Subunit: 224 residues, 2 copies
């Protein structure tokens, strides 16, 4: 991406009266820092989104977020399908982003420590099926990574993490004032389709090849 | 390239006792600035290289320098065959670079003006056959650009260049400490940094350029 750009386009669903949207973030490759960045950030946004957006704002039932391990590149995505105006819906997405922005500074030490212990036991587990660990290993094999002990490595990194680390992860990469902003949204229209700033104008994507015409490509990973 | 690296590898000849080498520069896309930058820099290092290196220094007969237009990306290339140690020859390459460094400060108004007039008639010359201009046009068509009046546009730009511009061209882009260093050499040794062992590992971790919006 061009490191600060946000583009979007729309697709009209003929049949269904519901609208879809998905917002995507190209963080980085899978370095040991970025795995724990994205896992921790994913864990901290699960329950307040669960609390306010689907429950309280009653947007819809399709409200998903999470990782994107693809092409040796890590990534962050948000999957929400509800029957709303999409820019309105964007406004409440950004409202949840500001909510998390305040929720950064609202973290105690205890919430931090119990939260990363929760993520640790969420991540660390011996398998319960031979097929389970085989699908994970095979998921390495299709990505040619082979980092067999990434778990203990990532936990050793996980113990070395501060609040200010994710602040510095937020400000340049994730915040609205970001020189490292890799943000892209996609609109899926419907059948007939407390503070918001001035977002920049995106552009529509008539030709995705001509879209990608001036976009560079990522390197691939040195295999472990 | 990762904007600073200078990578190299070697190839061993069988038949000829002469050694080859070629040094390449990823400059930028064909913008109107970069066309002038590279053409005028290449021509201003063309004639003193011929005067010093080949004529005066008498290194060898196969000595070449110059542009490389490919994939909508400009480039700079140097083709020298001689029977030498390749790093020895590199030292004289860097010596010619220092020679140019002094030649920056030795430019008069006259050298500047005769040089850009040289460049001008070098670029701006009417065709004498349909196949000539057709080959030029076809050379656009293979890059799908169609900027038919890039000649007068770039020449109108050419007058906007200064001497001090080429200092600005030298420092970040061309020097040895350069932050914008896109430098790569290739050794083609005689019959008898980091190394480049695997071209697969070459392609394993490098980004790709954007392409040009065609005019």
């Amino acid at each position: 991406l061009p490191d600060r750009g946000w583009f979007v386009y729309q697709q009209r669903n003929e049949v269904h009266n519901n609208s879809g949207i998905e917002i995507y973030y190209q963080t980085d490759m899978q370095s040991t820092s970025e795995n724990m960045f994205l896992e921790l950030f994913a864990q901290i946004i699960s329950e307040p989104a669960f609390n306010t957006l689907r429950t309280k704002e009653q947007l819809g039932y399709i409200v998903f977020s999470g990782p994107r391990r693809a092409n040796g590149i890590q990534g962050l995505r948000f999957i929400i399908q509800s029957e709303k105006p999409p820019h309105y819906l964007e406004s409440r997405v950004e409202a949840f982003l500001i909510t998390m922005e305040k929720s950064i500074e609202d973290m105690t030490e205890e919430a931090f420590q119990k939260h990363i212990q929760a993520l640790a036991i969420r991540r660390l587990d011996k398998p319960k099926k031979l097929s389970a660990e085989s699908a994970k290993y095979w998921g390495e094999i299709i990505s040619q990574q082979y980092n067999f002990d990434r778990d203990n490595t990532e936990v050793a990194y996980l113990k070395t993490l501060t609040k200010e680390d994710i602040i510095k992860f937020y400000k340049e990469m994730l915040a609205v004032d970001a020189p490292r902003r890799h943000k892209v949204s996609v609109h899926v229209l419907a059948r007939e389709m407390s503070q918001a700033p001035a977002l920049p104008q995106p552009e529509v994507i008539q030709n995705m090849t001509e879209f990608k015409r001036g976009l560079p490509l990522f390197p691939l990973v040195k295999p472990h």
